[PDB]
Coordinates of all heavy atoms in Angstrom, one line a residue:
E1 N 62.6 61.1 -91.3 CA 63.1 62.5 -91.6 C 64.2 62.9 -90.7 O 65.2 63.5 -91.1 CB 61.9 63.4 -91.4 CG 62.3 64.9 -91.4 CD 61.1 65.8 -91.5 OE1 60.3 65.9 -90.5 OE2 61.0 66.5 -92.6
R2 N 64.1 62.5 -89.4 CA 65.2 62.8 -88.4 C 66.5 62.1 -88.8 O 67.6 62.6 -88.6 CB 64.7 62.5 -87.0 CG 65.6 62.8 -85.9 CD 64.9 62.6 -84.6 NE 64.8 61.2 -84.2 CZ 64.0 60.7 -83.3 NH1 63.2 61.5 -82.6 NH2 63.9 59.4 -83.1
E3 N 66.4 60.8 -89.3 CA 67.5 60.1 -89.7 C 68.1 60.6 -91.0 O 69.3 60.6 -91.2 CB 67.1 58.6 -89.7 CG 68.3 57.6 -89.9 CD 67.8 56.2 -89.7 OE1 67.0 55.9 -88.9 OE2 68.4 55.3 -90.5
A4 N 67.2 61.0 -91.9 CA 67.7 61.5 -93.2 C 68.4 62.9 -93.0 O 69.3 63.2 -93.8 CB 66.5 61.7 -94.2
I5 N 68.0 63.7 -92.1 CA 68.7 65.0 -91.8 C 70.1 64.7 -91.3 O 71.0 65.4 -91.6 CB 67.9 65.9 -90.9 CG1 66.6 66.3 -91.6 CG2 68.7 67.1 -90.4 CD1 65.8 67.3 -90.8
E6 N 70.3 63.6 -90.5 CA 71.6 63.3 -90.0 C 72.6 62.9 -91.1 O 73.7 63.3 -91.1 CB 71.5 62.2 -88.9 CG 70.7 62.7 -87.7 CD 70.7 61.6 -86.6 OE1 70.3 60.4 -86.9 OE2 71.1 61.9 -85.5
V7 N 72.1 62.1 -92.1 CA 72.9 61.7 -93.2 C 73.2 62.9 -94.1 O 74.3 63.0 -94.7 CB 72.3 60.6 -94.0 CG1 71.8 59.5 -93.1 CG2 71.3 61.1 -95.0
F8 N 72.3 63.9 -94.1 CA 72.6 65.1 -94.9 C 73.8 65.9 -94.2 O 74.7 66.3 -94.9 CB 71.4 66.0 -94.9 CG 71.7 67.5 -95.3 CD1 71.9 67.8 -96.6 CD2 71.8 68.4 -94.4 CE1 72.2 69.1 -97.0 CE2 72.1 69.8 -94.7 CZ 72.3 70.1 -96.0
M9 N 73.7 66.2 -92.9 CA 74.8 66.8 -92.2 C 76.1 66.1 -92.4 O 77.1 66.7 -92.5 CB 74.4 67.0 -90.7 CG 73.1 67.6 -90.5 SD 73.2 69.4 -90.7 CE 74.0 69.9 -89.2
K10 N 76.0 64.7 -92.4 CA 77.2 63.9 -92.5 C 77.9 64.2 -93.9 O 79.1 64.1 -94.0 CB 76.8 62.4 -92.4 CG 78.0 61.5 -92.7 CD 77.6 60.1 -92.2 CE 78.2 59.0 -93.1 NZ 79.7 58.9 -93.0
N11 N 77.1 64.5 -94.9 CA 77.6 64.7 -96.3 C 77.7 66.1 -96.7 O 78.0 66.4 -97.9 CB 76.8 63.8 -97.2 CG 76.9 62.3 -96.9 OD1 75.9 61.7 -96.6 ND2 78.1 61.7 -97.1
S12 N 77.3 67.0 -95.8 CA 77.2 68.5 -96.2 C 78.6 69.1 -96.0 O 79.5 68.6 -95.3 CB 76.2 69.2 -95.4 OG 76.5 69.2 -94.0
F13 N 78.7 70.3 -96.6 CA 79.9 71.1 -96.6 C 79.6 72.6 -96.7 O 79.3 73.0 -97.8 CB 80.9 70.6 -97.6 CG 82.1 71.5 -97.8 CD1 83.1 71.7 -96.7 CD2 82.4 72.2 -99.0 CE1 84.2 72.5 -96.9 CE2 83.5 73.0 -99.1 CZ 84.4 73.2 -98.1
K14 N 79.7 73.3 -95.6 CA 79.6 74.8 -95.6 C 78.2 75.2 -96.3 O 78.1 76.0 -97.1 CB 80.7 75.5 -96.3 CG 82.1 75.3 -95.7 CD 83.1 76.1 -96.4 CE 84.0 76.9 -95.4 NZ 84.7 76.0 -94.5
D15 N 77.1 74.5 -95.8 CA 75.8 74.9 -96.2 C 75.4 76.3 -95.6 O 74.8 76.3 -94.6 CB 74.8 73.8 -95.9 CG 73.4 74.1 -96.4 OD1 73.3 74.9 -97.4 OD2 72.4 73.5 -96.0
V16 N 75.8 77.3 -96.3 CA 75.5 78.7 -95.8 C 74.0 79.0 -95.8 O 73.3 78.6 -96.7 CB 76.3 79.7 -96.6 CG1 75.9 79.8 -98.0 CG2 76.2 81.1 -95.9
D17 N 73.6 79.6 -94.7 CA 72.2 80.0 -94.5 C 71.2 78.8 -94.4 O 70.0 78.9 -94.5 CB 71.7 80.9 -95.6 CG 72.5 82.2 -95.8 OD1 73.1 82.6 -94.8 OD2 72.7 82.7 -96.9
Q18 N 71.8 77.6 -94.3 CA 71.0 76.3 -94.3 C 70.1 76.2 -95.5 O 69.1 75.5 -95.5 CB 70.2 76.1 -93.0 CG 71.0 75.9 -91.8 CD 71.4 77.3 -91.1 OE1 70.9 78.3 -91.4 NE2 72.4 77.2 -90.2
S19 N 70.5 76.9 -96.6 CA 69.6 77.0 -97.8 C 69.4 75.6 -98.4 O 68.3 75.3 -98.9 CB 70.2 77.9 -98.8 OG 71.2 77.3 -99.6
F20 N 70.4 74.7 -98.4 CA 70.2 73.4 -98.9 C 69.6 72.5 -97.9 O 68.9 71.5 -98.2 CB 71.6 72.8 -99.3 CG 71.9 73.1 -100.8 CD1 72.7 74.2 -101.1 CD2 71.5 72.3 -101.8 CE1 73.0 74.5 -102.4 CE2 71.8 72.6 -103.1 CZ 72.6 73.7 -103.4
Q21 N 69.7 72.8 -96.6 CA 69.0 72.0 -95.6 C 67.5 72.3 -95.6 O 66.7 71.4 -95.5 CB 69.6 72.3 -94.2 CG 69.1 71.4 -93.1 CD 69.4 71.9 -91.7 OE1 70.6 72.2 -91.4 NE2 68.5 71.9 -90.8
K22 N 67.2 73.6 -95.7 CA 65.7 74.0 -95.8 C 65.1 73.4 -97.0 O 63.9 73.0 -97.0 CB 65.6 75.5 -95.8 CG 66.3 76.2 -94.7 CD 65.3 76.3 -93.5 CE 66.1 76.2 -92.2 NZ 65.2 76.4 -91.0
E23 N 65.9 73.3 -98.2 CA 65.4 72.6 -99.3 C 65.0 71.2 -99.0 O 63.9 70.7 -99.5 CB 66.4 72.7 -100.5 CG 65.9 72.1 -101.8 CD 67.0 71.7 -102.8 OE1 68.0 71.1 -102.3 OE2 66.9 72.1 -104.0
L24 N 65.9 70.5 -98.3 CA 65.6 69.1 -98.0 C 64.4 69.0 -97.1 O 63.6 68.0 -97.2 CB 66.8 68.5 -97.2 CG 66.6 67.1 -96.5 CD1 66.3 66.0 -97.6 CD2 67.8 66.8 -95.7
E25 N 64.2 70.0 -96.2 CA 63.1 70.0 -95.3 C 61.8 70.1 -96.0 O 60.8 69.3 -95.8 CB 63.2 71.2 -94.3 CG 64.2 70.9 -93.2 CD 64.4 72.1 -92.3 OE1 63.8 73.1 -92.5 OE2 65.2 72.0 -91.3
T26 N 61.7 71.0 -97.0 CA 60.4 71.1 -97.8 C 60.2 69.9 -98.7 O 59.1 69.6 -99.1 CB 60.5 72.4 -98.6 OG1 61.4 72.2 -99.7 CG2 60.8 73.6 -97.8
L27 N 61.3 69.2 -99.1 CA 61.2 67.9 -99.8 C 60.6 66.8 -99.0 O 59.7 66.1 -99.4 CB 62.5 67.5 -100.4 CG 63.0 68.1 -101.7 CD1 64.3 67.5 -102.2 CD2 62.0 68.0 -102.8
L28 N 61.0 66.7 -97.7 CA 60.5 65.7 -96.8 C 59.1 66.0 -96.4 O 58.3 65.1 -96.2 CB 61.4 65.6 -95.6 CG 62.8 65.0 -95.9 CD1 63.6 64.7 -94.6 CD2 62.7 63.7 -96.8
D29 N 58.7 67.3 -96.3 CA 57.3 67.7 -96.0 C 56.5 67.2 -97.2 O 55.4 66.6 -97.0 CB 57.2 69.2 -95.9 CG 57.8 69.7 -94.6 OD1 58.4 68.8 -93.8 OD2 57.8 70.9 -94.4
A30 N 56.9 67.4 -98.4 CA 56.2 66.8 -99.6 C 56.1 65.3 -99.5 O 55.1 64.7 -100.0 CB 56.9 67.3 -100.9
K31 N 57.1 64.7 -99.0 CA 57.1 63.2 -98.8 C 56.0 62.8 -97.8 O 55.4 61.7 -97.8 CB 58.4 62.7 -98.4 CG 59.5 62.8 -99.5 CD 59.4 61.7 -100.4 CE 60.6 61.7 -101.4 NZ 60.6 60.5 -102.3
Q32 N 55.7 63.7 -96.8 CA 54.7 63.4 -95.8 C 53.3 63.4 -96.4 O 52.6 62.4 -96.2 CB 54.8 64.4 -94.6 CG 53.9 64.1 -93.4 CD 54.1 65.1 -92.3 OE1 54.4 64.7 -91.2 NE2 53.9 66.3 -92.6
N33 N 53.0 64.5 -97.1 CA 51.7 64.5 -97.7 C 51.5 63.5 -98.7 O 50.4 62.9 -98.9 CB 51.4 65.9 -98.3 CG 51.6 67.0 -97.3 OD1 51.0 67.0 -96.2 ND2 52.3 68.1 -97.7
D34 N 52.6 63.1 -99.4 CA 52.5 62.1 -100.5 C 52.2 60.7 -99.9 O 51.5 59.9 -100.5 CB 53.8 62.0 -101.3 CG 53.9 60.8 -102.1 OD1 53.2 60.7 -103.1 OD2 54.8 59.9 -101.8
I35 N 52.7 60.4 -98.7 CA 52.4 59.1 -98.1 C 51.1 59.2 -97.3 O 50.5 58.1 -97.1 CB 53.6 58.7 -97.2 CG1 53.5 57.2 -96.9 CG2 53.6 59.4 -95.9 CD1 53.7 56.3 -98.2
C36 N 50.7 60.3 -96.8 CA 49.5 60.4 -96.1 C 48.3 60.3 -97.0 O 47.2 59.8 -96.6 CB 49.4 61.7 -95.3 SG 50.3 61.7 -93.7
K37 N 48.4 60.8 -98.2 CA 47.3 60.7 -99.2 C 47.2 59.3 -99.9 O 46.1 58.9 -100.2 CB 47.4 61.8 -100.2 CG 46.5 61.7 -101.4 CD 47.2 62.1 -102.7 CE 46.4 61.6 -103.9 NZ 47.3 61.8 -105.1
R38 N 48.4 58.7 -100.1 CA 48.4 57.4 -100.7 C 47.9 56.3 -99.6 O 47.4 55.3 -100.0 CB 49.8 57.0 -101.2 CG 49.8 55.9 -102.2 CD 51.1 55.8 -103.0 NE 52.0 54.9 -102.4 CZ 52.1 53.6 -102.7 NH1 51.4 53.1 -103.7 NH2 53.0 52.8 -102.1
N39 N 48.1 56.6 -98.3 CA 47.6 55.8 -97.3 C 46.1 55.8 -97.2 O 45.5 54.8 -97.0 CB 48.2 56.3 -95.9 CG 47.5 55.6 -94.7 OD1 46.6 56.2 -94.1 ND2 47.9 54.4 -94.4
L40 N 45.5 57.0 -97.4 CA 44.0 57.1 -97.4 C 43.4 56.2 -98.5 O 42.5 55.3 -98.2 CB 43.6 58.5 -97.6 CG 43.9 59.5 -96.5 CD1 43.4 60.9 -96.8 CD2 43.4 59.0 -95.2
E41 N 43.8 56.3 -99.7 CA 43.2 55.6 -100.8 C 43.7 54.1 -100.8 O 43.1 53.3 -101.6 CB 43.5 56.3 -102.2 CG 45.0 56.5 -102.5 CD 45.2 57.4 -103.6 OE1 44.1 57.8 -104.3 OE2 46.3 57.8 -103.9
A42 N 44.7 53.8 -100.1 CA 45.0 52.4 -99.9 C 44.1 51.7 -98.9 O 43.8 50.5 -99.0 CB 46.5 52.2 -99.4
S43 N 43.6 52.5 -97.9 CA 42.5 52.0 -97.0 C 41.2 51.9 -97.7 O 40.5 50.9 -97.6 CB 42.4 52.9 -95.8 OG 41.3 52.5 -95.0

């Protein structure tokens, strides 16, 4: 997530109010629960 935010900043342009950054944040959060629950049933 920390590495993906850096590539976002690298490719961003005038992201006012960080509205597109916050969107990426909630997407990565959804990626966390998605891998945490698929990990459980893989065990």
Side-chain angles (χ1 to χ4, degrees):
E1 169 166 70
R2 185 170 77 193
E3 189 170 324
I5 294 189
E6 297 183 304
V7 317
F8 162 80
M9 305 284 284
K10 176 166 145 68
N11 298 112
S12 64
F13 170 66
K14 295 183 138 59
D15 187 15
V16 63
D17 306 329
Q18 293 86 18
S19 79
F20 272 92
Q21 190 190 313
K22 305 274 145 175
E23 186 201 44
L24 170 64
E25 280 173 2
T26 72
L27 278 183
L28 289 190
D29 292 359
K31 292 277 185 177
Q32 185 179 238
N33 303 311
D34 165 71
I35 199 63
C36 277
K37 167 219 164 193
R38 198 165 96 93
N39 170 260
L40 293 183
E41 57 194 352
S43 174

